[PDB]
Structures are given as structure tokens and as C-alpha cells.
Design a protein around this nucleic acid. Structure first.
Ligand SMILES: [Zn+2]
Lengths: 50, 109, 69, 89
RNA sequence: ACAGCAGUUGAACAUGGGUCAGUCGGUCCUGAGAGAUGGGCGAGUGCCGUUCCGAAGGGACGGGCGAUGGCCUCCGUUGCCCUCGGCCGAUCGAAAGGGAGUCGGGUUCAGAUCCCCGAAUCCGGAGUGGCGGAGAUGGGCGCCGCGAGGCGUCCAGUGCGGUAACGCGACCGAUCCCGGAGAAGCCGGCGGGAGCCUCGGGGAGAGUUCUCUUUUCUUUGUGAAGGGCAGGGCGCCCUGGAAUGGGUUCGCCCCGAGAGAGGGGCCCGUGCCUUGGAAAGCGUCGCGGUUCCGGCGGCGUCCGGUGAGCUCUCGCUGGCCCUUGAAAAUCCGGGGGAGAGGGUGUAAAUCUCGCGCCGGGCCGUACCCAUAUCCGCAGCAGGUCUCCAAGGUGAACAGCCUCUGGCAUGUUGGAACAAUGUAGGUAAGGGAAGUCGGCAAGCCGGAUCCGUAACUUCGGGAUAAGGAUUGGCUCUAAGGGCUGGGCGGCCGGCGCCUAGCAGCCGACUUAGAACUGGUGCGGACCAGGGGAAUCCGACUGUUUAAUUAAAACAAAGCAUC
RNA sequence: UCUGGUGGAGGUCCGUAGCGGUCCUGACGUGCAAAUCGGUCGUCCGACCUGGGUAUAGGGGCGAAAGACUAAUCGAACCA
């Protein structure tokens, strides 16, 4: 809701910032094994632990 | 456009009495026109008339009070009936003084 | 907003060190002299044009004057 | 309007005839206005059970549940006056 | 890739961006309750307990006794001692309870009572007085001054008015004490105010004009905070003394404990005018620059009437209760008079009066709020708390049609119209012969006028049962409000409103009649079939969420322990 | 005593919103749905309906009582 605490807002801020795709240059790093961000979270599909 | 021309034409006819018969009534007589509002309006008319008659000294306090309780007792249907009854009382009171003065004149003669 | 009904009171309000500006407005029927102070906007309504021009001349110096034309 | 039901016509047929008859006596006394012994005006109504108020002199009196004065109260008041007078004289 | 067809689309994917407050909430207070310490219990983590087995105050008028700093004659800060002093105990507990104070106009791609413009407001601080005003500036004795007006002395002065209710711009005062406000249910009925709807005109724009319609549609403002005036209310006051009782409400109700009558007082004032205010907003007609100028300009934003109308709100007055419908923070008033001030200055202490100066930190704020942003594994016919609520018909927030606003038929389309099905209808003559059973469907249905049985706990049964009417059109009768009563007035006998007369204004109904249609008319919509009995339970209520709503449970009453 | 008014009582009646869930033993029954849909129904000022906050926890609670309910789990839940 609009009414939220500071602790909850800071928790939602962090999940928002970590929902980004992998950068393109990571694939070029020597000995790289990551192809995509397997921890992508969609708001409608998966809900937060909160 | 949402014209009110049709409803205004029907309201004019309805004010004349049209579309208001037995076949056009769905609510009861009390739902359409409450008996309490009819009674309360009637008392306000008749009590107002009695107050004006008292103020202008057409009737006195003792005639006002008896007529007030008869109005509360549903004796007079409307203002016209109450006006005629007051006039009959005024004639009777005048007559009682007419034969009183006649009797006093005869006795003193 | 406060309404002042005396010219003498208006001059006192205008000469306050708090006063910031005098705004003159001309209407169809009256002329309104408005002095803006810290707390209230003081308005004087004058229905005579002869007295209106006199008030402009007697306005205190230095105080900003704006004509709402 | 009614032959015998009186004030308990509000209950219709919903309880026994004898129960409606018993409550008829109590409901008349619990809603009646009595004459105030302090100011003389007939305005002594019931606020709650055992509480009686006068709307003119604003006096509140502890009384009966449904009647202003219980018979037990009158006898006790008369008896206490006798016991007090015997102590004095 | 996903959105079960597509997709130039998306609540998908990618890149950027977006939430601004003293006056909107949180924050503060307590509620039901939760919970430490003291104490007790407990092998023990710990538990019980919330005033109960505690030396539970750390504060403060004021006074004294000392240090210290200053616009240092003096005052202020800091320690110690008297005086006062119940926390009737920490603390937590509400984004719907309590709780000071903000509202118009504009502005964005997305913010906004938060930004800009404008106009206000509350709280706190101001010591070294911020400026005014108040307190507060009189009287007596003389002298001089022609006299006014000044010189000396003495004595007052913590305001004033009204018979009163109370009023005026302030109008000292501590510990202590009393009170108020915060702070009270549900239902009914009336009345006031506003918003909306309605009606009659006047503007501006638009629609229709085949014929008519001087028409039909849209639009036709003034925030908070001050000031004044209506209006509403009053168990507020003064005169006075009432039965031939009177006053008065829709209902009531009121009076020698003071009616009616007259004259005042107070509270609320969300209404009107006014400052704010037209400069802004809107409507319409034009003229510019250029993407935006809150561009510029002209005209307008008018006058009325209605009402058991609906909604909100403010009042008054009742009904019900073996039901009586929070608490605390916080704020205020009063009682008392411990104190302080100055000796007549142009003065003091003091001031809840007017204006002036400074500040108001932290957190929330975007959007969905649901037949697609929430839960049900999903864009799931399920579930999920509220606010505003137009016209017509009509008892209605019923159903049916429409306007403002919204939408694209609910995860696809094309063609055809077979059986069986799901949903909706109709049917000759019979009229339950079907079937366990009238299951299902059908009949009745509104309103008005008549007329209503057995039985009964006398309340009911009851819309019992049964019958008639119902359209359209044209009339008639009845049902009300205001004003007046012998150029402008008025000193006057000269007038007499008196079966209530004249003029003006107005809305909603009721009853009766004529005419009239292929007897059709509660024409759609809405909308009880009924009667005679038996069994059970008295009734209202409740129950196995997801097969049993019942005769089961409860219940008032009765009785027992 | 009778009559005509006024008045507005009630765990009162018809009946919206709301709450519930009779019958069709209708639809659906690899459903829209691990209980939904339609018509028809009960109640609708009260023992009424409902949000939030609080309290009661497993041989325990709560129960106008059906062994009902206690997170799709109840003649003793769920987790290890
Ligand atoms: Zn009394």
C-alpha cells in the first residue's frame, strides 16, 4: 500500500535494484559460466518473502 | 442531446389530470400522498386562521380555545367550513344579546 | 485580508516599515488601494475619483506602487 | 381499540396469554409518570431499573424496579421510624 | 519467448524517468489487552504476577546559605539547607476511536490541500522589555496666573458599563481545592440551512427546419480566515399576576416553583453582503507572435419562482432497554489569597488586547484497488472493507429506457442450421388419466371500490375466501399563500374591513361526468394461486463451510440441587 | 359505553441492499470453480450484518451441540 514503513521501503528498494539483467561484457570474461540472470523475479509470477 | 420536451409535455397533461386514473396507480393512496402530511397541513391552515381571528379581535380567547380543541378533534374539514361555523357562533352570540336587551327593555318598561 | 474604512488609517498602514507594496486597482464603480504587509493585505475602497487621485499623490515615498492595468 | 390486551398489544400472539397478562401490569407501572413528592409536579419518570427522575426539579430517587415505591420499602421506613422513636422516648 | 487465434498491442522484454507537506496521515493518548522491575515460584531455560510481601519522589512556588557569569549600583546561572509532593507506578497497544493548525488558481509524459502564484493559519521562542495600547494617570488644601493653566503639600488609584440575563480591547497573582470540555446508545417525528433535481424568463454558442416549433441542447463562480446582517435555538433575565383557565405541537407538552402579553440577553451562525474578488476561472467573438507566451483584446458571467422532492448537516422533541450505550493524553473556567509594585512619577509590577521578528526536524506519499496489478498454482464466472450517486416511468436505491463518464461482448474468427443436448417459448380436444409424490411448469399477482368464515391465547387468522373497476381525450367540483383596507406625508370630528370583500400569486392531488377505440387498458416492466384437514415443533433465532435446514439445538417459562 | 380522528409500538408482515442457501435431486461434473452458475427460495430493527484490533493452542481450545470448527487437514491439527 501507499502507507509503508521505512524498513519495508528499503527492502523493496534492494529487490528492485537486483532485478536487472546480466551485463554483456561478463560473457567475455575468461572462464565465464553465467549466461543469464537466473534470479530474475517478476512481480505477478513470484511474490516476495515479505 | 437528452431533451425534456416529451416529459414536459406529459407533465402538463398530468397537471390537468391525465394519466392519473385507476390504471395508472401502483402505490397505495398513502404511498402516493401520506395521510399524516394531509392532516398536518390541515392543522397548520386551521390553527393559523384561528390565530389571525384572535389577533384581529374577531373571536376572543374563550372562543379561540374551544375552536382549537374542535380543530384537533377533526370537526372541520377545511377553512371554508370553519369560517362558516364562526359566523354562526357570532350570529348566535349577537342574538343572545338581542333578546337579552329586549327582555331587559320589556322588564324595565 | 482586512478592510479599512478610513483614509487616515490607510496612510498609517502604508507608512509601516512592514509594508511592501501598494497595488492600485480601478474598477467600474470604485478604486481599491491595497497595501501588502506581513500578516494582512489591507484594502481601502474609494468611490470618488477626485479623492482617488489625491491618495496617489499622498502615498509615502519609496514604497513600491503597482497599477493593475 | 382493544378489548383487553391494552399495552401488551405490541406483542401480538408471540407469547402466552398469562405471560402477557402478568407483564401488562408491570409495563403500565414502569412507564407511568408519578407525582413528585418534592416539587408536586407529575413528572417522576423512570431512568433505569430502580432509578426514578423528576424532569422539573431534577431529583433522582432510588425506587423499585417497576414501581416508584415498593411495599417492602414503605413497611421498612415505617418500622425504622418506630424503632428510632422508641430509642429516643 | 509469454499473454491458450493474431497482434504494428500489453500489467511481456529493453533503455530512461517518475512519489517534494509545520497546517494529509504516522509520530502523541489511552481502549480490549500485552508486558518488565519488587516479590513469589521454579532442577532449569524461565514462569506467575501489574499493585499485589518495595525505603518505588531526583521534581518544584518560594525562602535561606554559598560560588560563578553578565548591557556588573544590579540581575541571572550553579551547588547545599527548609518548604511543598499519592502517580491511585515502567513500558507497549488504533494509518477507521481521541488529537491545535490551509485553502483558491496554475503547472507534469507520469507529483501535488506537498511544486509556483496568492491569500491565511496553529504551535513554540524572543531574556538583554520590538513598537503601541491597558494598568494610569483623579481629588482636597492653598499660591501665582485677569482668568485658562502652572508651583508646593496631602490622600487615592491591581479597569469599566448594565436592575438583571450579561457586555466592553486588555483588565496581576503561587502551592492548594472544585468544576467543565475531550466524553457518548439505538429508533421515530417535525423544523432550519446547503447541494442536487424542477419551473418561468434574459444572454452566448450549437442542433433541427420536408412541415411546424419564437423552439431543443450546453453553459450562465466566488476558497479559507476576518467584519456586518439575516435565520435557527434557548429549563436565560426584567415588568406583571392568570378560572369564564389559558398558551401551544403533526404528536406532545407548559404555567402562582410565575402562563399569556410586552421588552431584553446569550449561543450557533456551513446562509447572504463584504475584504479576499476579478487582476483569477469559465463561455463566446477576434488579433498576434511562434510550439509556447497563465500572449493580447471585446462582450458576458443576469432576474426570478417553487417543493411531505432526494442527500448531507444543524436543531428541537419524544419512544425502548432486568441492554443505560469508553478511557486517557490535552485544553479551559472558577474558589482562595501566600505574594509582587509605586509613592504621585509621567511612574511600577503586570496584560489571555493590536501590530512587528525567528523557527517548525524524521517517516509515508507513484500506480492497481479488481470479470487483468490483491488471495484462490493463471488475465480463474469464486472471494475481498468503504466514499459520491443525474432524467423519465413508478411506492421505491425495484425492473425498463436515457445523459455525464466508460466499454468492445469478456483467452479466437468464417461458413452452415443435422441428430442429441443446454437455455427460452408456444400448442387443438381432454385436464394429473403421468409420477413414489403436481417434481417441473403453469394459474394468481399492482392499485381503487365493495365483501370477508371456522377457530382463537381476542392480539389475530386477513391480501382469508368472493366480486367489480382500471386506456385515451374534454370538462366540472373541492382542497391554499401574500397585500390592502376613511411628489410624499398627516394635526384632525368628518370614516367602519364585521353573511370575509378586492387584487395578486401558486403547487400537488382527490372525486364526479360526457365523449371515444375491432371491450382494449396494473397493455412492457414490476408483481401473493386458493380451500378443507392430520403429524411435529409454541413463535423469532441457530446448525453438520464441501450430499442431511429438520421434528434436531437454543429460547422465554416451569422445577430441582 | 359507542363513534370518528390523531399517534407510531413490535426479537410485527410484503419486499430492495446486505446476510443465507429450499427445490429443480436443473447446469457443470478431466468444470469458470479441489463446492461454482441460473431460476426459484429464507430473513431483511434485530438473538441483525460487517472491517480492524485483541484473547483462548492440540487430549488443548471453542462449540444456540452437527463430533461441528480449529489455514482445502479433525471421533485430537500441523512441523521435525
Ligand atoms: Zn419533582
Amino acid at each position: 500500500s501507499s502507507h509503508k514503513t521505512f524498513r519495508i521501503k528499503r527492502f523493496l528498494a534492494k529487490k528492485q535494484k537486483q532485478n536487472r539483467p546480466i551485463p554483456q561484457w561478463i560473457r567475455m570474461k575468461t572462464g565465464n559460466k553465467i549466461r543469464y540472470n537466473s534470479k530474475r523475479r517478476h512481480w505477478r509470477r513470484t511474490k516476495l518473502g515479505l | 442531446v437528452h431533451s425534456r420536451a416529451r416529459c414536459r409535455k406529459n407533465t402538463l397533461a398530468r397537471r390537468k389530470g391525465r394519466h392519473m386514473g385507476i390504471g395508472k396507480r401502483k402505490g397505495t393512496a398513502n404511498a402516493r400522498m401520506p395521510e399524516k402530511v394531509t392532516w398536518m397541513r390541515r392543522m397548520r391552515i386551521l390553527r393559523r386562521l384561528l390565530r389571525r381571528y384572535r389577533e384581529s379581535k374577531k373571536i376572543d380567547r374563550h372562543m379561540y380555545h374551544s375552536l382549537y380543541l374542535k380543530v384537533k378533534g377533526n370537526v372541520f374539514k377545511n377553512k371554508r367550513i370553519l369560517m362558516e361555523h364562526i359566523h354562526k357562533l357570532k350570529a348566535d352570540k349577537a342574538r343572545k344579546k338581542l333578546l337579552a336587551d329586549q327582555a331587559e327593555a320589556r322588564r324595565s318598561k | 485580508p482586512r478592510k479599512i474604512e478610513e483614509i487616515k488609517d490607510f496612510l498609517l498602514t502604508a507608512r509601516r516599515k512592514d509594508a511592501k507594496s501598494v497595488k492600485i486597482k480601478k474598477n467600474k464603480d470604485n478604486v481599491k488601494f491595497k497595501v501588502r504587509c506581513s500578516r494582512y493585505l489591507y484594502t481601502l475602497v474609494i468611490t470618488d475619483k477626485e479623492k482617488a487621485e489625491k491618495l496617489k499623490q499622498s502615498l509615502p515615498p519609496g514604497l513600491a506602487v503597482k497599477d493593475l492595468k | 381499540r382493544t378489548k383487553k390486551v391494552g399495552i401488551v398489544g405490541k406483542y401480538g400472539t408471540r407469547y402466552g396469554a398469562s405471560l402477557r397478562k402478568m407483564v401488562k401490569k408491570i409495563e403500565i407501572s414502569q412507564h407511568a409518570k408519578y407525582t413528585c413528592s418534592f416539587c408536586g409536579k407529575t413528572k417522576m419518570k423512570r431512568r433505569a431499573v430502580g432509578i426514578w427522575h423528576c424532569g422539573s426539579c431534577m431529583k433522582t430517587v432510588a425506587g423499585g424496579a417497576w414501581t416508584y415505591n415498593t411495599t417492602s420499602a414503605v413497611t421498612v421506613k415505617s418500622a425504622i421510624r418506630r424503632l428510632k422513636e422508641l430509642k429516643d422516648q
